[PDB]
């Protein structure tokens, strides 16, 4: 059930000899947290903006982007922005409204939702995240995590089908990143929407439903997190560390305690250690 399917894409950045993306091809399954990890120069920074039309591939004839059967183009770029909502990297910049209840309402204003239904939807979306008490707090009185929560609420209020956490937790402390990920997982379960993760935070790709790896503008490898992460040697030559569980597995392998490669969660590893403990 592919939702986003970028097929044979090319972006040149108007300026640079080497194109950012070269013949990228993948498909995002509906209702699956798909993490998309890569290096900074790999070109993953523009996947989010390409998905909802803010950037166009160089050859529209060769390069086709489909979002819920709506082939992205100069005309249909606005219907695609009614399905795909993106949470950008810097929380301060994307926070447009002068209060929390106004940043959330900025999406609904643009669609000409009547004010009473606007109030109902804004209250529901602000209370959906843990921001019910800060409905009047100003942009500068909020933390980095709180502004990301308000951004997620504003993306949520317009009822999207894809939430693209485009490096959303890049500038947050590790306690804030965990809170944001718990919130996004709960939202994805409740609203039954696809979540795409363009991040270099490997622990967030460790819990995804599908992992896409990019080198220099091309899809290197894909599959479940249980397959991409154990092959640490591939991730070494492209400049990417592996999550804590897999790194500890490799350290134990170097020490001498070999472990099977399907161990992906923390509890699985501690139980597998316990079975070896009894011996």
């Amino acid at each position: 059930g592919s939702d986003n399917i970028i097929s044979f894409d090319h972006v040149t950045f108007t300026d640079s000899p080497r194109p950012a993306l070269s013949d990228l091809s993948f498909a995002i399954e509906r209702g699956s947290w798909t993490a998309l990890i890569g290096h900074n120069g790999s070109g993953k920074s523009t996947v989010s903006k390409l998905i909802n039309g803010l950037l166009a591939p160089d050859d529209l004839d060769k390069s086709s982007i489909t979002v819920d059967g709506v082939k992205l183009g100069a005309d249909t770029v606005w219907e695609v922005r009614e399905k795909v909502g993106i949470v950008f990297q810097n929380p301060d910049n994307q926070f447009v409204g002068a209060t929390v209840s106004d940043d959330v309402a900025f999406g609904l204003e643009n669609r000409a939702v009547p004010r009473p239904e606007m109030l109902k939807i804004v209250a529901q979306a602000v209370a959906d995240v843990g921001m019910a008490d800060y409905a009047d707090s100003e942009p500068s009185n909020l933390s980095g995590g709180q502004k990301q929560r308000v951004a997620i609420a504003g993306i949520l209020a317009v009822k999207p089908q894809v939430i693209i956490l485009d490096e959303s937790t890049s500038m947050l402390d590790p306690e804030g990143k965990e809170q944001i990920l718990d919130l996004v997982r709960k939202i994805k379960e409740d609203n039954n929407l696809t979540v795409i993760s363009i991040t270099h935070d490997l622990e967030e790709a460790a819990g995804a439903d599908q992992v896409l790896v990019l080198d220099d503008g091309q899809l290197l490898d894909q599959g479940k997190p249980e397959e991409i992460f154990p092959k640490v040697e591939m991730l070494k030559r492209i400049g990417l560390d592996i999550p804590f569980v897999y790194r500890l597995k490799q350290l134990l392998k170097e020490r001498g305690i070999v472990l099977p490669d399907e161990i992906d969660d923390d509890e699985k590893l501690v139980q597998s250690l316990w079975q070896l403990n009894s011996k």
Binding site: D173, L202, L240, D241, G256, E267, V270, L273, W274
Partner: protein, 272 residues
């Protein structure tokens, strides 16, 4: 030794008493709003205290001290702020790096030498020098900004999340850069929220809460009391969290593990 004596700052700091001997990687921890940045600015007299004595780098900062004689202090104590690449302004990379030495008493030939050496040390490519700093990338701009504050070899470098927003590979490169800088005999102070770096690199852990020091000990003794850690407002290293999970699973680990290599070695020792 950097010594604070009943230092307080109002309009927030309140009765801080500690002494960080020179040559150690002091880490400064706490949630936002606990006066960490206030202490960081107090270090090089950017914010003079309202009551107290600071004996840092051989210069005494009292509440009534003036702005004359601070430029001699700021050559020894250098502050790198969060997202330090936002301060880049010069026409080229080399001029931007040497802007610091030039107004810290370096000659034109000396400043060029220091800037070139530290641009090599931070890892910027030799062709990237003498290009406009805005032409570079985020990591490269951070490297230029960090070279701009280490150029004059400061004694006490006080850092503020120097790798926030960077990938784990680049974060590890920068952390090893600062740890290698420590081996030269210079104190490094790290103001970070990522305790996984504190447990790995720090030798002395400060801990602020609401503007009052609550703990000053080695990171082994800071993270040994989970009751105290949850009682106040702090986070535990991931390796320590895993070790705590292992204990709750009935697998006892010798000693106190806090970093991944020592955690793995303790696991290997416990099984055999």
């Amino acid at each position: 030794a950097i010594k604070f004596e009943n230092v307080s700052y109002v309009y927030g700091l309140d009765q801080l008493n500690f002494s960080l001997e020179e040559g150690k990687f002091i880490a400064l921890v706490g949630h936002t709003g606990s006066g960490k940045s206030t202490l960081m600015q107090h270090f090089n007299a950017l914010l003079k205290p309202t009551s107290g004595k600071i004996e840092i780098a051989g210069y005494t900062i009292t509440p009534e001290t003036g702005n004359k004689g601070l430029k001699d202090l700021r050559r020894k104590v250098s502050l790198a702020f969060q997202f330090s690449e936002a301060q880049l302004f010069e026409n080229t990379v080399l001029k931007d790096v040497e802007y610091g030495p030039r107004n810290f008493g370096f000659s034109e030939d000396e400043a060029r030498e220091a800037a070139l050496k530290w641009l090599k040390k931070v890892g910027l490519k030799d062709d990237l020098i003498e290009h406009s700093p805005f032409d570079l990338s985020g990591g490269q701009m951070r490297r230029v900004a960090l070279a701009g504050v280490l150029a004059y070899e400061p004694e006490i470098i006080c850092l503020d999340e120097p790798a926030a927003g960077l990938d784990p590979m680049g974060r590890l490169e920068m952390m090893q850069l600062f740890k290698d800088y420590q081996a030269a005999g210079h104190t490094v102070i790290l103001v970070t929220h990522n305790m996984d770096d504190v447990a790995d690199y720090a030798d002395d852990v400060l801990a602020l809460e609401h503007g009052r020091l609550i703990k000053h000990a080695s990171p082994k003794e800071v993270f040994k009391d989970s009751e105290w850690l949850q009682k106040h407002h702090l986070a535990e290293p991931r390796s320590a969290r895993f070790a705590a999970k292992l204990e709750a699973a009935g697998l006892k680990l010798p000693g106190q593990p806090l970093t991944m290599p020592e955690l793995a070695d303790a696991i290997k020792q416990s099984l055999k």
